[PDB]
Structures are given as C-alpha cells and as structure tokens.
Amino acid sequence: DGESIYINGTAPTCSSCHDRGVAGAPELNAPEDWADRPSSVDELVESTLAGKGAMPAYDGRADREDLVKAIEYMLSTL
Numbered sequence: 001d002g003e004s005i006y007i008n009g010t011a012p013t014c015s016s017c018h019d020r021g022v023a024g025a026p027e028l029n030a031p032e033d034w035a036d037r038p039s040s041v042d043e044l045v046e047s048t049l050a051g052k053g054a055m056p057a058y059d060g061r062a063d064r065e066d067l068v069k070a071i072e073y074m075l076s077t078l
C-alpha cells in the first residue's frame with residue numbers, strides 16, 4: 001500500500017529522509033511542516049517529481065501514481 005511504497009517501495013526510499021527530517025524534510029505526524037505547503041496531493045506530487053531543496057527529482061524513478069499513494073500515506077499521519 002502507500003505505507004509499503006513510502007517505507008521501502010520507493011527509490012530513493014522516502015523513509016530514509018522523511019522519517020528523520022533530513023535537510024528539514026517535512027516529517028510524518030507533523031502538520032505544522034505541511035500547513036504552509038500546497039497540501040493538495042495533486043500539487044505536492046509535482047514538487048516531488050521535479051524535486052525540492054534536497055529532494056531529488058522523482059520523474060521516472062517513481063510514477064505520479066506511486067508518489068500519490070506515498071504522499072496520501074504521509075499526509076494521513078498529520
């Protein structure tokens with residue numbers, strides 16, 4: 001599911017950064033970190049595909065669908 005994707009079914013693995021908050025990556029169950037961001041999954045996924053700050057571009061490494069499933073999973077902890 002989205003959890004599987006987020007934890008291990010991603011390359012690079014989202015967990016590795018977001019679990020700890022590497023380079024200030026918006027963490028899980030941390031609504032404040034997301035409040036300011038365009039929380040809309042459909043927007044967040046673009047940021048994810050393109051890359052943001054330390055986050056590399058995902059375009060090709062993870063499909064929008066994969067990403068979406070991971071992102072909604074991330075957001076569901078907030």
Ligand code: HEM
Nearest residue numbers: 010012014017023024025037044047048052053054055070
């Ligand atoms: C794994 C595929 C993965 C997902 C999914 C993911 C999502 C994600 C979102 C939705 C954001 C916010 C986008 C926005 O602000 O519009 C976000 C932000 C950051 N991430 Fe991420 N992220 C995934 C993976 C990784 C990896 C592997 C790293 C560490 C190199 C990482 C880091 C960050 C950082 C830093 C940001 C934003 C920093 C900023 O400038 O605000 N993410 N991620």
